[PDB]
């Protein structure tokens, strides 16, 4: 019931499709998929306060947020955005993103801790739903 820990990915669906919707060019798409196939995920949870570090060779994101309070981060393709995380349920948080500048597909992400010990990351861009599953390492 604690998101804290080091996570390793075991499954990933539609990540490429997601990037395609976001306008990422064909080659970057392949580079991204490759890099994102073996990310290092570190999460530290203190009550409603979170620290999530996702590292890959070509891109590392570090976000700090408190459930319920807006913060700034970036969409998966690097566009700055305003995010707000809320609890959809006891083990699931949902984040709605708003581009700071310009227009683009509506994006969001959700992270859910399953009762049997796994972490499901869901990322969406318009109608595309990307599902990534992690287990503790």
Decide: 40 and 6 in contact? Cβ < 8 Å: yes
The first and second tokens of residue 20, run together, are 């395609």
The full set of domain ranges for the chain reads: 1-137
5: left (phi over 0), alpha (psi -120 to 50) or beta: left
Sheet with 80-87, strands from edge to edge, namely 60-66, 49-55, 40-46, 5-13, 128-136, 119-125, 107-113, 92-99, 80-87, 71-74
**Between β-strands 80-87 and 71-74, what pairing exists: parallel, antiparallel or unpaired?**
antiparallel
Q: Give binding residues for all-trans-retinoate as ranges.
A: 132-134
d(Cα 39, Cα 42) in Å, to the nearest integer?
A: 10
Question: What is the resolution in angstroms?
Answer: 2.0
What residues form the annotated binding site? 132-134
Cα 97 to Cα 92: distance, rounded to the nearest angstrom: 16
Read off the tokens for 131.
């599902």
Contact 119, 112 (CB under 8 A): yes
CATH topology of domain 1-137: Lipocalin (2.40.128)
């Amino acid at each position: 019931p604690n998101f804290s820990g080091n996570w390793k990915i075991i499954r990933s669906e539609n990540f490429e499709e997601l990037l395609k919707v976001l306008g990422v060019n064909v080659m970057l798409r392949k580079i991204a998929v490759a890099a994102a196939s073996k990310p290092a995920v570190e999460i530290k949870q203190e009550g409603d306060t979170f620290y999530i570090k996702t590292s890959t060779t070509v891109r590392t994101t570090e976000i700090n947020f408190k459930v319920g309070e807006e913060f700034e981060e970036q969409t998966v393709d690097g566009r700055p955005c305003k995010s707000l995380v809320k609890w959809e349920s006891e083990n699931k948080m949902v984040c709605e993103q708003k581009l700071l500048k310009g227009e683009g597909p509506k994006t969001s992400w959700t992270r859910e801790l399953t009762n049997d010990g796994e972490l499901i990351l869901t990322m969406t861009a318009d109608d595309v739903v990307c599902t990534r599953v992690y287990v503790r390492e």
